[PDB]
């Protein structure tokens, strides 16, 4: 199935495939964490888990959520250093767009620019294609909430319910089963579904100190991170 240096760099194998890129997809799973994103009628929610195995480590600096812009938020999975570098590039690109065009940048253009930047690594034979994923949420005028996803191969898309990480398949299956019912979506319902998805996929029944939640809505488009108290409030309201 292989002949020559197709296993070591990015050139076509005889069947028409290339493996140096689909190796990154399984390099994603090295972190062992999962994140979920849900879009509602007028809001968008990002939820993830966090694990602190030792008491000596300072728990205030292990967040995977990042504020790309006052209106656009993101979550990362995979190797940490690559995710940090991609965050840096995204910040610079958004600021440059604001400088050049005089108005705020749409989320889809930002995702496209990032994917186009990432596509070069799988074209030349001297670089390594950065095994880290990408999820962005934002609010757009005349469109409402928007949730987009980007991958190391350069394939970006726009979803309604997404999961990234170890448990991607069954979480997507559960989300599909829930969304086929076609019920009305409000803020509390979206947050409850997002939390219960992870809760039933992992079967933990966790505490208000082991997850992180970010939310955006059309009342204050600023990206905000929920404080532990109100997270506990949703958690207890979920359990009747």
């Amino acid at each position: 199935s292989s002949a020559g240096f197709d296993r070591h760099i990015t050139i076509f194998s005889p069947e028409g495939r290339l493996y140096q890129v689909e190796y990154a997809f399984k390099a994603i799973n090295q972190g062992g964490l999962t994140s979920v994103a849900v879009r509602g009628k007028d809001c968008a929610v990002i939820v993830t888990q966090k694990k602190v195995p030792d008491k000596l480590l300072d728990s205030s600096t292990v967040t995977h959520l990042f504020k790309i812009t006052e209106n656009i938020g993101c979550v990362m999975t995979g190797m940490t250093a690559d995710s940090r570098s991609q965050v840096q590039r995204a910040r610079y690109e958004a600021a440059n767009w604001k400088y050049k065009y005089g108005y705020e940048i749409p989320v889809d253009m930002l995702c496209k620019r990032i994917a186009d930047i990432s596509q070069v690594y799988t074209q030349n034979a001297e670089m390594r294609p950065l095994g880290c994923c990408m999820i962005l949420i934002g609010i757009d005028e005349e469109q409402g909430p928007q949730v987009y996803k980007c991958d190391p191969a350069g394939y970006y898309c726009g979803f309604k319910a997404t999961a990234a990480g170890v448990k991607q398949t069954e979480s997507t299956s559960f989300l599909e089963k829930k969304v086929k019912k076609k019920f009305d979506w409000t803020f509390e319902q979206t947050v409850e579904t997002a939390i219960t998805c992870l809760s039933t996929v992992l079967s933990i029944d966790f505490k208000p100190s082991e997850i992180e939640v970010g939310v955006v809505t059309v009342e204050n488009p600023k990206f905000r991170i929920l404080t532990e108290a109100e997270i506990d409030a949703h958690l207890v309201a979920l359990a009747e």
């Binding site: 190796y23 000596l56 480590l57 690559d82 001297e126 670089m127």
Partner: protein, 240 residues
């Protein structure tokens, strides 16, 4: 085989092998610990004497990055000195550009990005030094950060690097460092380094201690000689 010769080849299971080899190069360094107090941090390094010819004070492993920032290194000395130089130049550049002393959350990030830039391409090799940055400011308290050669930096309440890192952190966790001022911490640091590295492994060694915090009004410097004398005099009592 051959998947572990370049730094641009993912192995079939999806991970990079050269960086792991750099890690294994680090694990043979001696030891270095650092813990933060109520109003500062304290570093501690045990330095082995290879032969009697060398002079005291040779090849210090406790570097002074900036006027209020200190560094402790472990690994290969040459790469450590290069990293110290690049961090020093970066800090001076920041002070010239903006106009005040750089915070840790920015300097540590910049050095981490520069280190991570050397793990993608096949024309350069990954670094081989793991190091710690410490500081104290009146408006921000005490700050401690640790950076590894793979390009990852975290914040800690107390950390150890070298051969017996886990053995040291075992007695590190027993301490209630959250409360006391770091005037009595020197004695316990001396005690915790004299309880490792059995005399069977090596004959003699020496202690190097740093100091920064509000006690010094922001300056970073070596401890006075008499204080270290008293500290080691106290630490010798573990023979009981």
């Amino acid at each position: 085989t051959g998947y572990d010769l370049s730094a641009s080849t993912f192995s079939p299971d999806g991970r990079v092998f050269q960086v792991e080899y750099a890690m294994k190069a680090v694990e043979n360094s001696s030891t270095a610990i650092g813990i933060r107090c109520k109003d500062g941090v304290v570093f501690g390094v045990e330095k082995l004497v290879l032969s009697k010819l060398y002079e005291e004070g040779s090849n210090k492993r406790l570097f002074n990055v900036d006027r209020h920032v200190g560094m402790a290194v472990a690994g290969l000395l040459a790469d450590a000195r290069s990293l110290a130089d690049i961090a020093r130049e970066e800090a001076s550049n920041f002070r010239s550009n903006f106009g005040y002393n750089i915070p840790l959350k920015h300097l540590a990030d910049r050095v981490a990005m520069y280190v991570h830039a050397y793990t993608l391409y096949s024309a350069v090799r990954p670094f081989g030094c793991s190091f710690m940055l410490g500081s104290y400011s009146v408006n921000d308290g005490a700050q401690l950060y640790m950076i590894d050669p793979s390009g990852v930096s975290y914040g800690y309440w107390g950390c150890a690097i070298g051969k017996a890192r886990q053995a040291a952190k075992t007695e590190i966790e027993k301490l209630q460092m959250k409360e006391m001022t770091c005037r009595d911490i020197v004695k316990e640091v001396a005690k915790i380094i004299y309880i490792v590295h059995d005399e069977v492994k090596d004959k003699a060694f020496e202690l190097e201690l740093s100091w920064v915090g509000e006690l010094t009004n922001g300056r970073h410097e070596i401890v006075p000689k008499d204080i270290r004398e008293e500290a080691e005099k106290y630490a010798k009592e573990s023979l009981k």
